């Protein structure tokens, strides 16, 4: 088996070297592509925009994003998998030959296993939902041209994300291909599910509790058994160039809490009391109201994102991240429309 994964690793290293050497003027473009491809933008930009227009799309988008980031974590733990920025300096494969010279970037110090890519998986899962929903909405409200344009844009986005994750290292081509396929599969699976709407308040809590308990118990069971699931945190603390390039917000534990928090926040916002009576006469039916709601949500969420929880004790950071993630869907669905209604309603 060892002589089989080495071929894939060497192919990835050679591809990264070729991209980095023969394309040097596209560094900033690839960094920008890798920056605006974070899932943070799927909770702070896409969801507020898509919730106030055909609100059935926003709930599906949030559910797909959360379940995709839980499945990516769980399959990242078991599949293991290296990243082409510590493997180059740690392997003993490049003996009898010169080791290739690879370059690191302020974003190439990721902590975590990388067998399914997570940027590609999330981007595919979200943009497939968006494109399919738009095609369904504008279906004969010349369609072939729109179909071709939207699918071309989707595939261009996926290709650019793959090239970005390969150029800056931190991932192998088979990893990004697997991530794209898994994201598309998850998007389709939730495209054929109709129970995520009008769910009770007990359902959301039971679901998030089951996910958290499964993750924590699985980790504890393997840790007691003898294996170490958190092994990439030690290999990223030696081979990263600058010790300031690693952050705690990219620790497998942080993402899980940040996803459970936003799921619970969406549940609370949907099953609250202000949402059920947001309209008070003539409201929630006019374009100015919804456009102003979108603008206010975007501006206030962008301002509120600046509040960085203190990172001195890990438990405090985890709980504050949970609460801060829970705030955004609750404050974007229940509070801003209520304030706008009570101000410009009479
Ligand atoms: O695609 P990757 O390079 O593995 O990055 C994807 C991962 O980035 C962060 O570190 C988070 O832990 C995850 O929420 C995300 O899935």
Author numbering: 1 to 141, 147 to 351
Reproduce text from the manuscript describing this model.
Human glucose-6-phosphatase catalytic subunit 1 (hG6PC1) is a key enzyme in glucose metabolism, governing the final common step of gluconeogenesis and glycogenolysis, and directly regulating energy homeostasis. G6PC1 catalyzes the conversion of G6P to free glucose, which is then transported to various tissues through the bloodstream, supporting essential physiological functions. G6PC1 contains a transmembrane domain (TMD) composed of nine transmembrane helices and an extracellular domain (ECD) formed by two extracellular helices and two extracellular loops.
Therefore, we introduced the H176N mutation to block the initial step of hydrolysis to capture the state of G6PC1 bound to the substrate G6P before the beginning of the reaction. G6P is roughly oriented parallel to the membrane, with its phosphate group positioned at the bottom of the cavity and the glucose moiety near the opening, tilted toward the cytosol. Three cryo-EM densities (W1, W2, W3) in the active center are identified as water molecules, which form a hydrogen bond network with nearby residues to stabilize G6P. G6P interacts extensively with conserved residues from EL1, EL2, TM1, TM2, TM3, and TM4. The putative imidazole nitrogen (H176) is 2.7 Å from the phosphorus atom of the phosphate group, facilitating the formation of a phosphohistidine bond during hydrolysis. Notably, EL2 undergoes dramatic rotation toward the active center, which, together with other changes in ECD, reduces the volume of the substrate-binding pocket from 1651.0 Å3 to 1364.0 Å3. The comparison suggests that PS is likely directly engaged in stabilizing the partially open state of G6PC1G6P.
